[PDB]
Design a protein around this ligand. Structure first.
Ligand SMILES: OC[C@H]1O[C@@H](O[C@H]2[C@H](O)[C@H](O)[C@H](O[C@H]3[C@H](O)[C@H](O)[C@H](O[C@H]4[C@H](O)[C@H](O)[C@H](O[C@H]5[C@H](O)[C@H](O)[C@H](O)O[C@@H]5CO)O[C@@H]4CO)O[C@@H]3CO)O[C@@H]2CO)[C@@H](O)[C@@H](O)[C@@H]1O
Length: 97
């Protein structure tokens, strides 16, 4: 039961990380990706992790994994053993709550 969150980025700036905060069922098992179209073809930077006792999960990916010229994509949740939602993401110095 996939969940998709669209995003837009600069095509040029690639310093730092793409950081995602999720809230979900404590101790849940979760995975997904950061996906994007690269010259029309879909590529995926997979992520996985378990929520802590408070139900929080932070995912970090280097921005350098997204090729130059890419301007849009989706944060995707794939597997979630309980509940999971994106509460914030940060890329290229910009938070999105
Ligand atoms: O460890 C937990 C659990 O994992 C189990 O195996 C999982 C596995 O870990 C993954 O969760 C896997 O994930 C697949 C998803 O179920 C789903 O099919 C997903 O589909 C994506 C697709 O990959 C792609 O990103 C697609 O992007 C679109 C985009 O949305 C946009 O429309 C654009 O224009 O087009 C692109 C391309 O079409 O979006 C889809 C989501 O809608 O793909 C995942 C794999 O890449 O599922 C497995 C379960 O079947 C087991 O190992 C288990 O034992 C273990 O407990």
């Amino acid at each position: 039961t996939a969940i998709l969150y669209p995003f837009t980025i600069s095509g040029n700036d690639r310093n730092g990380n793409f950081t995602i905060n999720f809230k979900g069922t404590p101790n849940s098992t979760n995975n997904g990706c950061i996906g994007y179209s690269y010259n029309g073809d879909w590529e995926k930077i997979e992520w996985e992790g378990s929520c802590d006792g408070n139900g929080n999960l932070v995912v970090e990916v280097p921005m350098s994994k997204i090729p130059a010229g890419v301007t849009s994509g989706e944060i995707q949740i794939w597997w979630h053993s309980g509940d999971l939602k994106m509460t914030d993401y940060k890329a290229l110095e910009h938070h999105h709550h």
